[PDB]
Design an enzyme around this catalytic site. Structure first.
Site, PDB file in Angstrom:
ATOM      1  N   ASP A  56     -54.905  30.830 -42.320  1.00  0.00           N
ATOM      2  CA  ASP A  56     -55.760  29.599 -42.449  1.00  0.00           C
ATOM      3  C   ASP A  56     -56.816  29.520 -41.349  1.00  0.00           C
ATOM      4  OD1 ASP A  56     -56.836  27.204 -43.048  1.00  0.00           O
ATOM      5  OD2 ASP A  56     -55.187  25.950 -42.219  1.00  0.00           O
ATOM      6  N   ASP A  93     -63.243  28.362 -44.353  1.00  0.00           N
ATOM      7  CA  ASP A  93     -61.829  27.900 -44.405  1.00  0.00           C
ATOM      8  C   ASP A  93     -61.024  28.693 -45.410  1.00  0.00           C
ATOM      9  OD1 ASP A  93     -59.398  26.481 -44.531  1.00  0.00           O
ATOM     10  OD2 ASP A  93     -60.314  24.525 -44.722  1.00  0.00           O
TER      11      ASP A  93
HETATM   12  C1  LIG Z   1     -58.070  20.383 -51.528  1.00  0.00           C
HETATM   13  C2  LIG Z   1     -57.250  21.410 -50.760  1.00  0.00           C
HETATM   14  C3  LIG Z   1     -57.219  21.308 -49.342  1.00  0.00           C
HETATM   15  C4  LIG Z   1     -56.450  22.237 -48.636  1.00  0.00           C
HETATM   16  C5  LIG Z   1     -55.719  23.220 -49.300  1.00  0.00           C
HETATM   17  C6  LIG Z   1     -55.810  23.376 -50.682  1.00  0.00           C
HETATM   18  C7  LIG Z   1     -56.567  22.430 -51.424  1.00  0.00           C
HETATM   19  C8  LIG Z   1     -55.069  24.510 -51.297  1.00  0.00           C
HETATM   20  O1  LIG Z   1     -55.193  24.398 -52.724  1.00  0.00           O
HETATM   21  N1  LIG Z   1     -54.748  25.610 -50.556  1.00  0.00           N
HETATM   22  C9  LIG Z   1     -53.956  26.703 -51.048  1.00  0.00           C
HETATM   23  C10 LIG Z   1     -54.804  27.960 -51.211  1.00  0.00           C
HETATM   24  C11 LIG Z   1     -54.731  28.724 -52.389  1.00  0.00           C
HETATM   25  C12 LIG Z   1     -55.549  29.861 -52.557  1.00  0.00           C
HETATM   26  C13 LIG Z   1     -56.444  30.213 -51.533  1.00  0.00           C
HETATM   27  C14 LIG Z   1     -56.552  29.447 -50.371  1.00  0.00           C
HETATM   28  C15 LIG Z   1     -55.760  28.308 -50.253  1.00  0.00           C
HETATM   29  C16 LIG Z   1     -52.742  26.799 -50.119  1.00  0.00           C
HETATM   30  C17 LIG Z   1     -53.034  26.505 -48.657  1.00  0.00           C
HETATM   31  C18 LIG Z   1     -52.495  25.462 -48.006  1.00  0.00           C
HETATM   32  C19 LIG Z   1     -52.875  25.312 -46.548  1.00  0.00           C
HETATM   33  O2  LIG Z   1     -53.669  24.125 -46.274  1.00  0.00           O
HETATM   34  C20 LIG Z   1     -54.548  24.310 -45.140  1.00  0.00           C
HETATM   35  C21 LIG Z   1     -55.609  23.231 -45.148  1.00  0.00           C
HETATM   36  C22 LIG Z   1     -56.752  23.529 -44.185  1.00  0.00           C
HETATM   37  O3  LIG Z   1     -56.245  23.699 -42.839  1.00  0.00           O
HETATM   38  C23 LIG Z   1     -57.866  22.467 -44.249  1.00  0.00           C
HETATM   39  N2  LIG Z   1     -58.962  22.692 -43.297  1.00  0.00           N
HETATM   40  C24 LIG Z   1     -59.803  21.523 -42.875  1.00  0.00           C
HETATM   41  C25 LIG Z   1     -58.948  20.425 -42.241  1.00  0.00           C
HETATM   42  C26 LIG Z   1     -58.901  19.140 -42.784  1.00  0.00           C
HETATM   43  C27 LIG Z   1     -58.074  18.192 -42.194  1.00  0.00           C
HETATM   44  C28 LIG Z   1     -57.353  18.490 -41.040  1.00  0.00           C
HETATM   45  C29 LIG Z   1     -57.401  19.755 -40.502  1.00  0.00           C
HETATM   46  C30 LIG Z   1     -56.648  20.255 -39.308  1.00  0.00           C
HETATM   47  C31 LIG Z   1     -57.535  20.239 -38.079  1.00  0.00           C
HETATM   48  C32 LIG Z   1     -55.266  19.648 -39.084  1.00  0.00           C
HETATM   49  C33 LIG Z   1     -58.219  20.710 -41.097  1.00  0.00           C
HETATM   50  N3  LIG Z   1     -56.166  23.219 -46.476  1.00  0.00           N
HETATM   51  C34 LIG Z   1     -56.340  22.086 -47.152  1.00  0.00           C
HETATM   52  O4  LIG Z   1     -56.365  20.905 -46.665  1.00  0.00           O
END
Ligand SMILES: Cc1cc2cc(c1)C(=O)N[C@@H](c1ccccc1)C/C=C/COC[C@@H]([C@H](O)CNCc1cccc(C(C)C)c1)NC2=O
Length: 373
Positions: free
Chosen positions: A34, A217
Site C-alpha cells: 500500500d 496509491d
Molecule cells: C474506495 C477504496 C479505498 C481504499 C481501498 C479500496 C477501495 C480497495 O477496494 N482496495 C483493495 C484493492 C484491490 C485491488 C487493487 C488495489 C486495492 C484492497 C486494499 C485495501 C487496503 O486499503 C488501503 C487504503 C489506502 O491506504 C488509502 N490511501 C489514502 C488514505 C485515506 C485515508 C487515510 C489514510 C491513511 C493515512 C491512514 C490514507 N485504501 C483505501 O482506503
C-alpha cells in the site's frame, strides 16, 4: 533483482500482496502492498476472513510498545496494539529488520473474504503514520538498518507482478522512464497539469486536478477524481461512447455492464491521458490509459456467459487518487532518494489498435502553478 521478480500475487480486484515473515521463529503472512499509507499492520487475532494471523506469544523477539493505535482509511478501518519485531521478505532483499508492527485486534470492512492477505505494508512517509509521525514506517527502518538503496518500484499486472526493493529491473518495462516530482513527502503526492479524454482537453484550471492533493496509491483500486473533474470526465466519456447508453448506476460504479463473452466493444470507449508535472519548468509527460484499464472485469462464475465490468473511475472528496487501475501496466518507480516517481510502460500492459503509453515532453506557455495549496 531477478530473485524479486514475480514476488506479488492477488485476486482480481482484491489487492496485491507480498509474502513476509514476522517474529522469531518466522511466521509467514501475505501482506498487502500500500503506497497510500504508512503503517505496517497484521491481523493478530481470529477473523472470519483470515486464514492465519500473527501470534505474538510465539515470538521471542516481540516487544510490546504499550500503546494502542486506530487507523481509519477511506474504505475500512482497524485498531490494535503497537510493538516491534523482526521482519523479513523471503522474495525481497536478503535482510532481517526490526520494525514497528500494529497487531490488529478489531477491524471493520478492512479484510476481504478470499483476498489471501492478512496484513498491510504502508510504504509512504512517516508524516501520515498513526498515531503520529514518530512511528517510523517499515521502509524507513529497512533503509536505516541495511544497505538497501532508498527506492522501490512496483509492476502491478492486472493477478501478480513485482515489487523490486532497492532498485529498478530493466526487464520489467520498455521505452523510457519519465519522472514527476514528489511534491511533498507524506503520501506520494504528485501534480497533474492536464487531463484529456480522446485527446480533448477537459479545459479546467489545473489546480482543480489536484484539489486538494493528488496521490499515487497502490492500496486503492480506482482512479478517484475530485467532484468537478469526475463530472467533467464522465460527461466526456459518455459523449465518446454515445453509440451505447448505460444506466446511471454504471457511471456511479454501482452496477455492472455486461456483454456476450468476447464481444466487449473496446473501440467505443476513449483513452484517457493524464499529464504529470515534469522535472523541468512547465514541461510535462503523459500516461495514457485504455478502457481495458478503467473498465475492471468482475469475475463471477454466475455471470460468466458474459464479460461484466465495473466503471473504475469514481468521485473523491479527498483529492485525486491514482489507484491500481492507473498503476497496472506501468512500471512505477518510487525514487525516494531523489524525491521523484518514475513511470514507464510495463512489460505487462493493449488492443491490436491502441497501446497505453508514457511519453513526452509537452510544454505549456501558461505560468500557473498547478499545485492546490
Ligand atoms: C474506495 C477504496 C479505498 C481504499 C481501498 C479500496 C477501495 C480497495 O477496494 N482496495 C483493495 C484493492 C484491490 C485491488 C487493487 C488495489 C486495492 C484492497 C486494499 C485495501 C487496503 O486499503 C488501503 C487504503 C489506502 O491506504 C488509502 N490511501 C489514502 C488514505 C485515506 C485515508 C487515510 C489514510 C491513511 C493515512 C491512514 C490514507 N485504501 C483505501 O482506503
Amino acid at each position: 533483482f531477478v530473485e524479486m521478480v514475480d514476488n506479488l500475487r492477488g485476486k482480481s480486484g482484491q489487492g496485491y500482496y507480498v509474502e513476509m515473515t514476522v517474529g522469531s521463529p518466522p511466521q509467514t503472512l501475505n501482506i498487502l502492498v500500500d503506497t497510500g499509507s504508512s503503517n505496517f499492520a497484521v491481523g493478530a487475532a481470529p477473523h472470519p476472513f483470515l486464514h492465519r494471523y500473527y501470534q505474538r506469544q510465539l515470538s521471542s523477539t516481540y516487544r510490546d510498545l504499550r500503546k494502542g493505535v486506530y487507523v481509519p482509511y477511506t474504505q475500512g478501518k482497524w485498531e490494535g496494539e503497537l510493538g516491534t519485531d523482526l521482519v523479513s521478505i523471503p522474495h525481497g532483499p536478503n535482510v532481517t529488520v526490526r520494525a514497528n508492527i500494529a497487531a490488529i485486534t478489531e477491524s471493520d470492512k478492512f479484510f476481504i473474504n478470499g483476498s489471501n492477505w492478512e496484513g498491510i505494508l504502508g510504504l509512504a512517509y512517516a508524516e501520515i503514520a498513526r498515531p503520529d509521525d514518530s512511528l517510523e514506517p517499515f521502509f524507513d527502518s529497512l533503509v536505516k538498518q541495511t544497505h538497501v538503496p532508498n527506492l522501490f518500484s512496483l509492476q502491478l499486472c492486472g493477478v501478480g507482478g513485482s515489487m523490486i526493493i532497492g532498485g529498478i529491473d530493466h526487464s520489467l518495462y520498455t521505452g523510457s522512464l519519465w519522472y514527476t516530482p514528489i511534491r511533498r513527502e507524506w503520501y506520494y503526492e504528485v501534480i497533474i497539469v492536464r487531463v484529456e479524454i480522446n485527446g480533448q482537453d477537459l479545459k479546467m484550471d489545473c489546480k482543480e486536478y489536484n484539489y486538494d492533493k493528488s496521490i499515487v496509491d497502490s492500496g486503492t483500486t480506482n482512479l478517484r477524481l475530485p467532484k468537478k473533474v469526475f463530472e467533467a470526465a464522465v460527461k466526456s466519456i459518455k459523449a465518446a461512447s454515445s453509440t451505447e447508453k448505460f444506466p446511471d448506476g454504471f457511471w456511479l460504479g454501482e452496477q455492472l455492464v455486461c456483454w456476450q463473452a468476447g464481444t466487449t466493444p473496446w473501440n467505443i470507449f476513449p483513452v484517457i491521458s493524464l499529464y504529470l508535472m515534469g522535472e523541468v519548468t512547465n514541461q510535462s509527460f503523459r500516461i495514457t490509459i485504455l478502457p481495458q484499464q478503467y473498465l475492471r472485469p468482475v469475475e463471477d462464475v454466475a455471470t460468466s456467459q458474459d464479460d461484466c465490468y465495473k466503471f473504475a473511475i469514481s468521485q473523491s472528496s479527498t483529492g485525486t487518487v491514482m489507484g491500481a487501475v492507473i498503476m497496472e501496466g506501468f512500471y512505477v518507480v518510487f525514487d525516494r532518494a531523489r524525491k521523484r516517481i518514475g513511470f514507464a510502460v510495463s512489460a505487462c500492459h493493449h488492443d491490436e489498435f491502441r497501446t497505453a503509453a508514457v511519453e513526452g515532453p509537452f510544454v505549456t506557455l501558461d505560468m500557473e502553478d498547478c499545485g492546490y495549496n
